[PDB]
Write a protein that binds this ligand. Structure first.
Ligand SMILES: NC(=O)CN1C(=O)[C@@H](NC(=O)C2=CC3=C[C@H](Cl)SC3=N2)Cc2ccccc21
Ligand SMILES: NC(=O)CN1C(=O)[C@@H](NC(=O)C2=CC3=C[C@H](Cl)SC3=N2)Cc2ccccc21
Ligand SMILES: *Cc1c(COP(=O)(O)O)cnc(C)c1O
Ligand SMILES: *Cc1c(COP(=O)(O)O)cnc(C)c1O
Lengths: 803, 805
C-alpha cells in the first residue's frame, strides 16, 4: 500500500466492501457460489463508478453557470485503453479498493486484467486525444471529446506461424459500465440528397442516419472534476418487410468499425460517411448548447480538429450558419474561422486526405458547393496578396486537378482555421518551410507549434507505481499534476539510495513483464538482459527494418566470434500492421523468422533473444514500457511528426536510441545530448541525399556486414522452406527505399555498441537514466494543453479542486 | 383512488425504502436529478427499484432447483409474447400499492410511468401469448421450468394506420436498454451451420459457426417467492477485405434480428430455418450441460422438452445427433431417450400453416440432421409396416418424407414419431386430430394422443388489466381465486345479488370511460361510452372472418338508413389486429374496415348510434386496455378453423358476453357457462364438411338474401370507395367464388344472433346477470389448470403452490 495510491481508511474500506457486495447481488444477480471472475470485475467497476456520479453531475452543472468558453476536441479516434485503474487513481481510491478486495479474498490486479481495452484508435493521434481528455479535466477546462463509438475498435492481432492475423475487436461484448447512453439527445444526420436554391439553399431528399450519443466520464487528477467524452453510435431511423428490417444494418454500419489506416489515405466512401457523421451530430450538439446571436459563438466555442479527419466541420458549420440560421456568408465565415483550429500530425503525402469531387458531389452536395465557394474566396485572397502568381494559386487551391479531381482537406483546414499547429518544434518548422510554405507566407500568424505530450497519470502513476513512489519519497506528490517538478531529481544523481532504488524498480518491472509473457504465451525471456524495445505501428518510415538489420548484425557477429562476451539482450518488437499494407506484414514475418533462427541457435542461447510482442495496444504499453531499458525511436529524419511512445519510455526509465526527428529533438535538448543516444542522418543530410539521388547499392558494395545480411535475406537463410519469401523486402531496400535504411545502418550499429558499453556499467547507466526521467517534465500533456488553451483556445487552465 | 385491497399493503416502512431506492437509482444508475430527469428516466428508476426485489428470490429459487434436483421442464418456443413486465412483477410480489404510494409521495403518477414501457412483442398472436401465460403459470405452480427462445432485436412490427391502410414499422423494443433482462455471457454456446458429414462413427465438420448468447428474464410466480427463467438466445458472430469481413458479421447476427410476422402461414425461408435450429441447438446443449451437473437412461426423468408447434421440431434430430455422434450411445437407446424426453403441441389444422422444408435446403444447411431424419423415417415406417402389413398407402401418408416436384420433410410427422405425447389445444381440436388430420398416427399409437385445453393467466388477464373487477370479486369470495380460479364458481350464488349486479355494471362502465379516455388522449378519436362496446381483436385472417363482422356492420348502417327514426341500441364496433405484411387479402380487409368507418362515422343521420373504428397496433398492452372495456366478444371463426383461441377466454374472464361459432374452445366456454348464457350461431363442424362434400356455392346465398345483395353491390359499385370504385373488387370476387371460409353461409344466422345481442343489451339487469353467469364459470380457462394437466399427464411432475421461504 504505497503512499501515492492513497489511504485505506477503515470506514471507507467497509463501505466499499458493502457496495461491492451490493452490486454483485443486485446488479450482477450473483452470489459467491456462482460468481465468475468477470462478475467480480464488474462488481468493482460499478462500485468505483458510483463515486464518479456526483462529481460528474456537479461538474457539468458548474460549467452551465460559470458559462466558460467550451472546448470541443473533435477526433475520429480516442485510444482510451482501460478505465478502472485510471478512475481509482484520479479519485484517490486505489489503496482503499485494493484493501476492500483483499479482505473479500480477491486480487484487484487480477480483476483489472479482465477489462477490455477501449481501443478506439490506431496509435499516436488517437492516444494523444486520450491523454488530452485526461489533461483537460485535470486543468479544469470545460472540455468535451467528440468521436465515434465504434462497435469494433482496432483489430486484435494474433500471430499465427509468424504472421499477423486480424480478429474483430469485440470490445462491447459483455457490456461497458463506463459509458452512459444518452438516447434523448439522439440527432439526425443527413446523406445524399440534392440542393435547391431560392432566400437560400435547402438540402432536400436526404437519407437519414440517427446519431445516438454515449457519454463516458473523464476524471481529473484529484480535483473532483469529471468532463465528458461523447461518442456517437449510428442508428437506423424508424425482399419486402424482412429485408427492410435487415437493411437497417447498412446505415448502422457507419459506426461499425475503426479504419485501421494509420498514416495512410484509402478513399473509402464509408470512411467519408464516418467523418461527416461525427461532424454533423457534434456540431448540432455544440449549437444546441450555445443557444443554451452568433457574434459571440467563437467566444463560447473552440473546435479543435485532430488532423483533417473531422475537416468537414468547416463547411458543416458554414452550412448550418448560412442555410439554417440564415447568417450572411462573410459573417458566417468570420465565425467559422475564429471557432476552428487544425492539428496536423504527419508530412507523409500518402497520409493526406484528398476526397474525389464526384464522391463528395453524391454524398454531400451542399458541402461540395460551400467548399467551392470557400475556395473561390480564399484564392481571391491569395491573388490579392501575390498578384499574377498563377502556380501559387494552383498549389494552394482546395481543388486538385487531374484524371480524378479531388478536394485537399488539409488546404480546406488551413483556410477555415485561425490556428494551424504541428505537434513538435521541428515538424511545425517543416510545415512553415516546406509542406505549407505558401499558406505560411499568406498568413504567417496562423502557424503554431504545440509539442505533443502524455499524461503522467496513466503513463507513470498507473503503469509504474513503484517508480512513482520512489520519486514521491524524495519530492512529494505535487509533480503528478505539475511534472516540471521532476527536475528536482537532478539533485539526486549522486544519491546512493536513489540510484539503487531507480535500478531496483526497473528490475522489478522487468521481472513483472517476464512473468506476463511466461503466463499468457508460455514465452520465457531472461530478466537479466538489456530489454531493447521497439513498440509502435509497423511502417517503413518507423524502420522496424533498420532494427532487424541490427539484430542480424548482432547474431552474425556472435557467429563470427562465438567466445566473445556480448551484453545479453532481449530485443522485443511490437505493433500492428494495417490490413492492406503488404510490406508491413512482411516486416512482421521477418521479425518472427529472425526470431525463429536466433532463438534456436545453441551458440547464442540467452545472449540474444528476438521476440515479437503480440497485440501491441494501450494496456500492453502499460506493461512493457516500465520494463524497457532501451527505447527504439529510429524513424528517418523528417518522417515522424512527433512520436509519443518516445515520451513514455523517457518517463519510465529507459534510455533512448534515436534520430533527431519529431520530439526526440526536444527530449535530447531537455536531458542533454550527453544523456541521449543520438545517431544518423539529420533532416539536412536526408535532403542532400535526395538532391543527389539515394543509391542503396553503394552501401551494399562497401559495407561487408550489410552485404552478408542482404544475401542471407535473399538466399533463404531466414526462410528455408520458402527461400524467396523476403525478395520484396530485399528489392525494396536495394532499389526502392523511401526511408534510406542503409544510409543509417553504420551509425546505428556503432551507436548500439555504445549503448551496450554503457550497460556494462550499471551505475552510470542508472545515473544517465535519472538525468532522463528528471528532464521529462516538458512532455506532460498538461503543458501541451495549457499551451493550446492559452495560445489557441483563449482559456485559462486551473488545477483548483471543485467543492 | 385507487389503493384497493387486492393490490396489497402500502406499508410505511416499505414505502419509505422504495422511495429511497427510487432516488438512489435515479442518481447512481441513471445519472440524473429532478431538474432534468425525463418521465422515462422515472419509469427506469421505478423499474430498477422493483427489479431489485426479484433478485433474492431468483437466486434462491434457482439454487433450490440445483439442490432438490427436480425434473426440469424446458418449454421450447420460437415465440414468447410477454407484453410489459413492470406491473406483472409488482402484482406478483405484492408491491403495486406500496409503489403507487411511494411514487405518489414523489409527485408521480405510476400508471403514467407504466405506459412508457415497450411491449416485449416476441410473438405473433395466440401461440406466443400462450407460451407467456404458461411461463407465468409454471412459476405460480412451482415447477422447475425454463422457457427457451430467441431474443429478436425486432419483435412483432408496430402497426401504423395511414390513409386507412396498414404500414409496418420496426419494433425497436430494445432502444433504451432492457432492464428486465440479464445477459449471461459465460453461457454463450456455438451453433453450427452448413458443413458436411464425415465418417470415422459419423462427424459433422467444416461448419460455419454462430455464437448463441443467453439473456435471462425473471418469471415471478404469484406470491410464492418463486422466480423462474425465460432464457432467450441472441446471435453473435464468432471472433475468427478486412472491413467487409467485419461488416459481414451482420449476416450471422441477422438470425436473431427479426420475428417472422407469419401468423399460421409457412413461408419456407432459409432464415426462418436458421432461427429454428439456432434456438434448438443452443437450448439442447444447455439442457445437457445442466443434466451432467453421464448415464442418459435417467435423462427423461430429469428433462422434459415441450415443442410449441413444429417450429422447434429439429429438437428431435438434434438430440439424436448429440446422443449418437457426441455421446456415442447406440441408436435404439438414443431414440428411446429422445421420445421419452419430447412432446409436441399442435396449434392448427390449416394445411398452409404446416412446415414442410425442402430436402435440398436441409441437405445444405443441416446435412447431418437430414440423414438422421431419413434414418428416423426408415425405422418409423418399418414399425408402421409391421403393424399394418400390406397398407402401402398408409406408408405414403405417414412418411416423414413428402414426394413431389419439390421433396420435403413434414415436420409434424417428425414431431409425432419422436414424441411420447402429442396434444391438441382444445377438446374439439384434439378430436379432429385423432379422427382425421393425424388419423393414421392415432391408429398406430393411440396412447400418444391427448388434449390440453388452452388457458390464460388470471394475473395479467384479470388482476393486472382489470383490478376493479378483481376487487369486487375479492370482496365477496376473498383472494384465493387468483391462483385457484375455479373458485369463481362461488359468484354464481350472487346472480340475484343486487349490489353485485350493480358493482359489475359499475366496473364495466368505469373500464369503458377509461378506454374512451385512452382513444381521446392518444389518438383524437371520439367514442360514446354509453354504447355497447362490440370488439373483435385478433390477427387479421380470412378464417377469423373480420369480413363477416364487416357485412354485419354494413347491415346495421343500411338498417338505420331505411328507418332513420327507428331506435337502435347504440354501438361502437371495434376491430383490431395485425395483417401479415404480404397477405394481400388481410391488408385489403383492414382497408375495408377503415373505409366502412369513413362512411358510417361521417353520416349525420347515424352519428353516435353507430361508430366503426379500427384499433391501431393491437398487441398485448392494448389487449389489457380494451378487453376489460368490451361488452361483446366477437369470436366468429368458421367451424373447425380455430384450434382453441385464447382472446375468447380473456373476454369471458373480464365481463364480455360472447358471440361466436361452435369452434375451438368456444365449445367448452358455452358448456362451462351453459349455452343459454352464450350467443351461439352458425354452422357446426358437421355443417362445414357436409357443405364441402356437396360443394359450397356462395352465389346460392346471394340470390336469396336481399340485404346481403345490397351490401355486395355497395362494395363492387364503390359506395365504400367512391374515389377508387373497384378498390374492393378482389374481396367481392373471393366472397362470390373463392371463399374457403363460407362467409355468406353464416351471415343470416349471425345478423339474427346479433339482434338477440342488442335485445338483451336493452335489458341491463339481465345483460349483467348473464355476464355474472360467464365470469363465474371462466375458471376452467386458467392456464393454471392447463399447466397442471401438462405436468401430470405429460411431464410427470406434481405442481405445488406452496410458498418458497
Ligand atoms: N442511460 C439510459 O438511458 C438508461 N439506463 C442507464 O443509464 C444504465 N446506466 C448506465 O449505463 C450508466 C450509469 C453510469 C454512471 C457512470 Cl459514472 S457511467 C454510467 N453508465 C442503466 C440502464 C439499464 C437498463 C436500461 C436503461 C439504463
Ligand atoms: N451483462 C453482464 O454480465 C454484466 N452486467 C449486467 O448483467 C447488468 N445487469 C443487468 O443487466 C441485470 C440485473 C438484473 C436483475 C434482474 Cl431481476 S433482471 C437484471 N438485469 C449491469 C451491467 C452494466 C454494465 C456492464 C455489464 C453489466
Ligand atoms: C503511445 C502509443 C503509440 C504511439 O507510439 P509512437 O512510438 O509515437 O508511434 C501507439 N500505440 C500505442 C498503443 C501507444 O500507447
Ligand atoms: C390473446 C391474444 C391473442 C390471441 O387472440 P385470439 O382471438 O385467440 O386469436 C392475439 N394477440 C394478442 C395481443 C392477445 O393478447
Amino acid at each position: 500500500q504505497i503512499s501515492v495510491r492513497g489511504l485505506a481508511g477503515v470506514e471507507n474500506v467497509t463501505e466499499l466492501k458493502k457496495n461491492f457486495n451490493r452490486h454483485l447481488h443486485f446488479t450482477l444477480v450473483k452470489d459467491r457460489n456462482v460468481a465468475t471472475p468477470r462478475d467480480y470485475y464488474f462488481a468493482l467497476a460499478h462500485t468505483v463508478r458510483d463515486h464518479l456520479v456526483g462529481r460528474w453531475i456537479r461538474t457539468q452543472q458548474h460549467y452551465y453557470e460559470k458559462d466558460p468558453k467550451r472546448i470541443y476536441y473533435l477526433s475520429l479516434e480516442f485510444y482510451m485503453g482501460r478505465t478502472l485503474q485510471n478512475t481509482m487513481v484520479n479519485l484517490a481510491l486505489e489503496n482503499a479498493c485494493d484493501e476492500a478486495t483483499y479482505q473479500l479474498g480477491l486480487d484487484m490486479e487480477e480483476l483489472e486484467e479482465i477489462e477490455e481495452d477501449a481501443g478506439l484508435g490506431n496509435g499516436g493521434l488517437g492516444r494523444l486525444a486520450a491523454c488530452f481528455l485526461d489533461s483537460m479535466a485535470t486543468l479544469g477546462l470545460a472540455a468535451y471529446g467528440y468521436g465515434i463509438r465504434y462497435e469494433f475498435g482496432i483489430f486484435n492481432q494474433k500471430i499465427c506461424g509468424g504472421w499477423q492475423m486480424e480478429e474483430a475487436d469485440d470490445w462491447l461484448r459483455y457490456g461497458n459500465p463506463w459509458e452512459k447512453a444518452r438516447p434523448e439527445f439522439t440527432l439526425p444526420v443527413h446523406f445524399y440528397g440534392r440542393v435547391e436554391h431560392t432566400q437560400g439553399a435547402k438540402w432536400v431528399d436526404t437519407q437519414v442516419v440517427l446519431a445516438m450519443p454515449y457519454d463516458t466520464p473523464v476524471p481529473g487528477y484529484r480535483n473532483n472534476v469529471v468532463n465528458t467524452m461523447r461518442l456517437w453510435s449510428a442508428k437506423a431511423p424508424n425482399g419486402g418487410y424482412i429485408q427492410a428490417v435487415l437493411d437497417r444494418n447498412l446505415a448502422e454500419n457507419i459506426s461499425r468499425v475503426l479504419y485501421p489506416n494509420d498514416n495512410f489515405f484509402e478513399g473509402k466512401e464509408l470512411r467519408l460517411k464516418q467523418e461527416y457523421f461525427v461532424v454533423a451530430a457534434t456540431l448540432q450538439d455544440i449549437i444546441r448548447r450555445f443557444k443554451s446571436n452568433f457574434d459571440a459563438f467563437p467566444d463560447k466555442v473552440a473546435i479543435q480538429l485532430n488532423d483533417t479527419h473531422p475537416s468537414l466541420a468547416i463547411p458543416e458549420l458554414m452550412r448550418v450558419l448560412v442555410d439554417l440560421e440564415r447568417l450572411d456568408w462573410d459573417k458566417a465565415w468570420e465565425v467559422t474561422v475564429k471557432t476552428c483550429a487544425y492539428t496536423n500530425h504527419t508530412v507523409i503525402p500518402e497520409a493526406l486526405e484528398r476526397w474525389p469531387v464526384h464522391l463528395l458531389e453524391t454524398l454531400l452536395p451542399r458541402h461540395l458547393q460551400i467548399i467551392y465557394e470557400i475556395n473561390q474566396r480564399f484564392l481571391n485572397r491569395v491573388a490579392a496578396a501575390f498578384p499574377g502568381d498563377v502556380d501559387r494559386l494552383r498549389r494552394m487551391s482546395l481543388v486538385e486537378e487531374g484524371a480524378v479531381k479531388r478536394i485537399n482537406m488539409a488546404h480546406l483546414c488551413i483556410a477555415g482555421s485561425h490556428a494551424v499547429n504541428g505537434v513538435a518544434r521541428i515538424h511545425s518548422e517543416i510545415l512553415k518551410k516546406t509542406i505549407f510554405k505558401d499558406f505560411y507566407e499568406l498568413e504567417p500568424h496562423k502557424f503554431q507549434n504545440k509539442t505533443n505530450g502524455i499524461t503522467p497519470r496513466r503513463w507513470l502513476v498507473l503503469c509504474n507505481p513503484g517508480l512513482a513512489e520512489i520519486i514521491a519519497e524524495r519530492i512529494g506528490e505535487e509533480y503528478i499534476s505539475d511534472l516540471d517538478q521532476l527536475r528536482k531529481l537532478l539533485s539526486y544523481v549522486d544519491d546512493e539510495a536513489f540510484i539503487r532504488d531507480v535500478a531496483k524498480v526497473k528490475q522489478e518491472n522487468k521481472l513483472k513483464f517476464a512473468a506476463y509473457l511466461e503466463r499468457e504465451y508460455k514465452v520465457h525471456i531472461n530478466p537479466n538482459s538489456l530489454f531493447d524495445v521497439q513498440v509502435k505501428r509497423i511502417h517503413e518510415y518507423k524502420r522496424q527494418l533498420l532494427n532487424c538489420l541490427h539484430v542480424i548484425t548482432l547474431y552474425n557477429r556472435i557467429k563470427k566470434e562465438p567466445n566473445k562476451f556480448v551484453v545479453p539482450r532481449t530485443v522485443m518488437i511490437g505493433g500492428k500492421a494495417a490490413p492492406g499494407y503488404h510490406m508491413a506484414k512482411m516486416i512482421i514475418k521477418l521479425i518472427t523468422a529472425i526470431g525463429d533462427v536466433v532463438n534456436h541457435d545453441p551458440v547464442v542461447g540467452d545472449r540474444l533473444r528476438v521476440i515479437f510482442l503480440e497485440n501491441y495496444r494501450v494496456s500492453l504499453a502499460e506493461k512493457v514500457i516500465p520494463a524497457a531499458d532501451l527505447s527504439e525511436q529510429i524513424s528517418t529524419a523528417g518522417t515522424e511528426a512527433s512520436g509519443t511512445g518516445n515520451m513514455k519510455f523517457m518517463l519510465n526509465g529507459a534510455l533512448t536510441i534515436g534520430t533527431m526527428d519529431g520530439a526526440n529533438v526536444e527530449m535530447a535538448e531537455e536531458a542533454g545530448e550527453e544523456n541521449f543516444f543520438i545517431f544518423g542522418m539529420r533532416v539536412e543530410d536526408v535532403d542532400r541525399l535526395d538532391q543527389r539521388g539515394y543509391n542503396a547499392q553503394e552501401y551494399y558494395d562497401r559495407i561487408p556486414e550489410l552485404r552478408q545480411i542482404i544475401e542471407q535475406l535473399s538466399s533463404g537463410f531466414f526462410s528455408p522452406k520458402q527461400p524467396d519469401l523476403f525478395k520484396d523486402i530485399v528489392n525494396m531496400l536495394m532499389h526502392h527505399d523511401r526511408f534510406k535504411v542503409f544510409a543509417d545502418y553504420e551509425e546505428y550499429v556503432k551507436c548500439q555498441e555504445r549503448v551496450s558499453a554503457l550497460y556494462k556499467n550499471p551505475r552510470e547507466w542508472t545515473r544517465m537514466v535519472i538525468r532522463n526521467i528528471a528532464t521529462s517534465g516538458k512532455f506532460s500533456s498538461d503543458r501541451t494543453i495549457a499551451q493550446y488553451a492559452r495560445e489557441i483556445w483563449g482559456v485559462e487552465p486551473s488545477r483548483q479542486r471543485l467543492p
